[PDB]
Amino acid sequence: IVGGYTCGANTVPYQVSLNSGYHFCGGSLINSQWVVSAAHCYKSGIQVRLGEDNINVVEGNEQFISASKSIVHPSYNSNTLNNDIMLIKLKSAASLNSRVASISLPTSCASAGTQCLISGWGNTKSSGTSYPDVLKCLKAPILSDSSCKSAYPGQITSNMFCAGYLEGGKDSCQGDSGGPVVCSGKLQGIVSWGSGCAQKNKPGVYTKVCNYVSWIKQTIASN
């Protein structure tokens, strides 16, 4: 997260860190046994770390659970990142409480101007890599479709939306992928891609979760 602030320990209880010996992507807890992340974060050997704040120190509240299976969307396209969403089933259920909680799926899509909270342990520099130890937060609005398409002509599908600042300075970045974009208490987006991080006129692009709710429900119900 570039231009963001320290969230404060456990203030984002649905945030998870996907770990393979180091933090590589974020994710969101949607129920005690399932996490939603991005398809491009897929790899085998994923350990899901819940209740984290400093990812390099065990401070208490952490629950480390291995992924039992990861389900990448069948129509995921790695070249366009269209359908960039993945579900991870946990080997055992997590204990939910005030420090570890799930986030609700949306019932409707959000409109441009909606202010959302994006969080993650991704890079904090737009020119260089500085990865943080604690969770960072950024409040960002969803942009209109014309501004998004004018910024990325021909690369935005109906399963994506842009959120951020065209002046540059505040944005999500590598390491934040797979993480949550929460608006009015509902998970509306998944950090997916962008051109560089926090560059002017190049906002972040997110997977539009309202388009996958029946897919998530049907897939969870059959697995």
Ligand X SMILES: Cc1cc(Br)c([O-])c(-c2cc3cc(C(N)=[NH2+])ccc3[nH]2)c1
Give the active site residues: 40, 84, 177
Could you say which of Ca ion, Cl ion, ligand X, none residue 194 binds, taking C-beta under 5 to 8 angstroms by partner kind?
ligand X
- Known binding residues for Ca(2+): 52, 54, 57, 62
- Interacting positions 173-212 with ligand X (CB under 6 A): 173-174, 176-177, 191, 193-194, 197, 204
Q: What angle do CA 84, 202, 28 make, to 5 degrees?
A: 35
The count of residues interacting with Cl ion (CB under 5 A) is: 2
**Contact present, 12 and 4 (Cβ < 8 Å):** no
Rounded least distance, CB 117 to Ca ion, Å: 21
**How big, in percent rounded to 5, are the helix, strand and coil portions of the chain?**
10, 35, 55
Which among 19, 92, 30 has a CA at the least distance from the CA of 56?
19
Nearer Cβ to ligand X (61/174): 174
Candidates 51-59, 85-93, 180-188, 209-217 — which segment interacts with Ca ion by CB under 5 A? Answer: 51-59
Strands across the sheet with 204-208, in order? 5-6, 136-141, 115-120, 180-183, 186-193, 204-208, 160-163
Candidates 25-33, 57-65, 121-129, 182-190 — which segment interacts with Ca ion by CB under 5 A? Answer: 57-65
Nearer Cβ to Ca ion (73/99): 99
Cα 87 from chain centroid?
12
Residues in the site for ligand X, rule: CB under 6 A? 40, 171-174, 176-177, 191, 193-194, 197, 204
